[PDB]
């Protein structure tokens, strides 16, 4: 286990590899850690409150219940971290590698996830309420249960995903692939789907939630 004086201080000096590293319940608020390589790292529950994690490799990280609000996570790796019950709202996300990612009830709320990379990351219960997630990859991705209100996924990928159960009362799916996505009835009725590119399939079912019926 190191010590928030000691990173601080390897970290100033320029080192930069901290893989494997035990950082359980660290106190790092506003810390700027930038390119640092965390792969492995175990930070369960910590505080990195308005951190600034820009392209850090934290690749395959514990993150379980780590408080990540505001942070930046910018380019950041995040491949096959566990971020089950991390504070995420408000961070910035922005073209951040998370696929495989777990963060099944993670709080995403206002979170920037634009261009991001979540294929296969597994979503499920987590909160993505006005979350920004323009152009980003959820292909594969689990949706189970997840809160989209008020969701911008315009321009996402969602082919093969699975919605089901999502909330997506005024959620905006403007030109998002849908190809092989599973969804309940009522997204076609809530979310905004101009341009949006679905099956044959999905396009019965557009007309199906809309009532019509087929003989």
């Given at each position: 286990h190191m010590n928030v004086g000691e990173i601080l201080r390897h970290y100033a000096a320029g080192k930069r590899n901290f893989q494997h590293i035990n950082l359980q319940e660290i106190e790092l608020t506003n810390a700027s850690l930038t390119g640092?390589?965390?792969?492995?790292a175990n930070l369960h529950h910590a505080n990195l409150s308005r951190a600034n994690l820009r392209s850090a490799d934290l690749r395959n990280a514990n993150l379980s219940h780590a408080n990540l609000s505001g942070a930046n996570l910018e380019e950041a790796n995040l491949e096959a971290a566990n971020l089950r019950g991390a504070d995420l709202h408000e961070a910035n996300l922005s073209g951040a590698d998370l696929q495989e990612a777990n963060l099944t009830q993670a709080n995403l709320k206002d979170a920037n996830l634009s261009d991001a990379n979540l294929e296969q990351a597994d979503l499920a219960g987590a909160d993505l309420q006005g979350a920004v997630l323009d152009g980003a990859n959820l292909h594969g991705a689990n949706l189970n249960n997840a809160?989209?209100?008020?969701a911008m996924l315009t321009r996402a990928n969602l082919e093969q995903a699975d919605l089901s159960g999502a909330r997506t009362t005024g959620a905006r799916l403007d030109d998002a692939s849908?190809?092989?996505a599973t969804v309940d009835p009522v997204l076609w009725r809530t979310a905004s789907l101009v341009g949006a590119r679905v099956d044959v399939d999905q396009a019965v079912a557009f007309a199906a939630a809309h009532g019509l019926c087929l003989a």
């Open positions: 640092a390589d965390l792969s492995y809160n989209l209100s008020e849908l190809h092989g």
